[PDB]
């Protein structure tokens, strides 16, 4: 069985683009190559790390389950989750965002340090995707995250990386001078992934449990 994805790319269907999810979903498939790029894939400008590696791993996946790794209301009590939308990801004329990624903003004039983790008990490898925001201007960084020395730390037994986003104005892509770089990792069963950040973090909302046999 193949996986047909609209006009969309692999990133668009896996990131949760507002227009991509309305077309197709699937669990068992063997072919994934539909459209490379320059399509509905990334509604927000950014760089997808290890895109070709993710394409190879995602190819020929027997079982695929979509689950909420972090509930929207429960996971982040001291941050605002409803403020994160953009016109570049607009759906049906209303500003929207990725369905699998949730934008985290400040609440009540503060952005407290966050530490959230997920333990994998699904007996299947879990695909976790997140993003790090790179504001175009320093003033926007202070307004949304209330910190200039932003840090995002994703640490697990198999994967470990610390991101320090830097404010840099970039050429306008999809009416957004700012950028959000996307990163992903695979969580082996029995392992826990830790998220620590003071801001500029696009925390995961939905994850995918997959098997390759």
């Amino acid at each position: 069985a193949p996986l047909q994805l609209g006009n969309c790319s692999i990133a668009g269907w896996i990131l949760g683009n507002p227009e991509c999810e309305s077309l197709f979903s699937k669990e068992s498939w063997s072919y994934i190559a539909e459209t490379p790029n320059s399509e509905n894939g990334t509604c927000y400008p950014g760089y997808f790390a290890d895109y070709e590696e993710l394409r190879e791993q995602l190819s020929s996946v027997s079982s695929f389950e979509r689950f909420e790794i972090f509930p929207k209301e429960s996971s982040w009590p001291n941050h605002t989750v409803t403020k994160g939308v953009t016109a570049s990801c607009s759906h049906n004329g209303k500003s929207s965002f990725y369905r699998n990624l949730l934008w985290l903003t400040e609440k009540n004039g503060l952005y407290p340090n966050l530490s959230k983790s997920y333990v994998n008990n699904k007996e299947k490898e879990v695909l976790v995707l997140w993003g790090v925001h790179h504001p175009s201007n320093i003033e926007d960084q202070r307004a949304i995250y209330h910190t200039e020395n932003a840090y995002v730390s994703v640490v697990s037994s198999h994967y470990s990386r610390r991101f320090t986003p830097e404010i840099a104005k970039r050429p306008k892509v999809r009416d957004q001078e700012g950028r959000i770089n996307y990163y992903w990792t695979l969580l082996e069963p029995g392992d826990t992934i830790i998220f620590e950040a003071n801001g500029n973090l696009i925390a995961p909302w939905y994850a995918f449990a997959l098997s390759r046999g």
Partner: antibody, heavy 126, light 108 residues
Framework: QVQLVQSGAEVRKPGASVKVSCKAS????????IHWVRQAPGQGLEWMGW????????KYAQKFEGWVTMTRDTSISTVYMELSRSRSDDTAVYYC???????????????????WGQGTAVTVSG | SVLTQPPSVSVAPGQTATITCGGN??????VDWFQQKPGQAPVLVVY???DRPSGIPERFSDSNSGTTATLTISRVEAGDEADYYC???????????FGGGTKLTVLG
């Protein structure tokens, strides 16, 4: 209902310390920013700065930078605005406004000014 | 940023009055309008896209249309006579710059 009651009328000599209070009631004090504007008699509004009760952060305008100072007191839900040095041109009505209008998008993440005070008549012109 | 407003705009009752606020203000940039009656604190009338907050009549509408800010009041009544200001947020300094002000006169 949510309201901001300001201090009474003030008369000062040039170079004096003009301090204006702004008491908040009807809502959680440490929620939104408090903005200060100055209106010369029969003139437009001039933005001075903002202070957030929760964090205490202050960002003043270039015209008012240095000689104005915004403080806060969470115990009494009062924000203060002290002008260290005063002049005749500073004679105006000073308003304190609450930024209770939550934004909608990160592209336009600003807290709009919805609840205003009553004004404080500051006449220096000593 | 600097926002320029006409000193006074005259409209007869029943007609439609348009107040102009100029400057490099991009497409939306919030653009908030305030109403100041004599001897009274300013009150917000429209924010974001239209969005009359509490009791502001539906006759009030805020349309940008390019590098200009426009406030439109239809079927102007006596109560609409006040001074209207335009306010944006310059994201290059996070400063809430106000407009010059417009005295809307309902010709009686």
């Amino acid at each position: 209902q949510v309201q901001l009651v300001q201090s009474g009328a003030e008369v000062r000599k040039p170079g004096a310390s003009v301090k204006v209070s702004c008491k908040a009631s009807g809502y959680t004090f440490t929620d939104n920013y408090i903005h200060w504007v100055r209106q010369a008699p029969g003139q437009g509004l001039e933005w001075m700065g903002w202070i957030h009760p929760n964090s205490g952060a202050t960002k003043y305008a270039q015209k008012f930078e240095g000689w104005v100072t915004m403080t806060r007191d969470t115990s009494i839900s009062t924000v203060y605005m002290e002008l260290s040095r005063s002049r005749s041109d500073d004679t105006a009505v000073y308003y304190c406004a609450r930024a209770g209008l939550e934004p909608r998008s990160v592209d336009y993440y600003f807290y709009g000014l919805d609840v205003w005070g009553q004004g404080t008549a500051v006449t220096v012109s000593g | 940023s600097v926002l320029t407003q006409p000193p006074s705009v005259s409209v007869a009752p029943g007609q439609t009055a348009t107040i102009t606020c100029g400057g490099n203000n991009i497409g939306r940039k919030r653009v908030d309008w305030f109403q100041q009656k004599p001897g009274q604190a300013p009150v917000l009338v429209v924010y974001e896209d239209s969005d009359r907050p509490s009791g502001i009549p539906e006759r009030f509408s805020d349309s940008n249309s390019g590098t200009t800010a426009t406030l439109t009041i239809s079927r102007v009544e006596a109560g609409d006579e006040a001074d209207y200001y335009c306010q944006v947020w310059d994201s290059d300094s996070d400063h809430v710059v106000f407009g010059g002000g417009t005295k809307l006169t309902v010709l009686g």
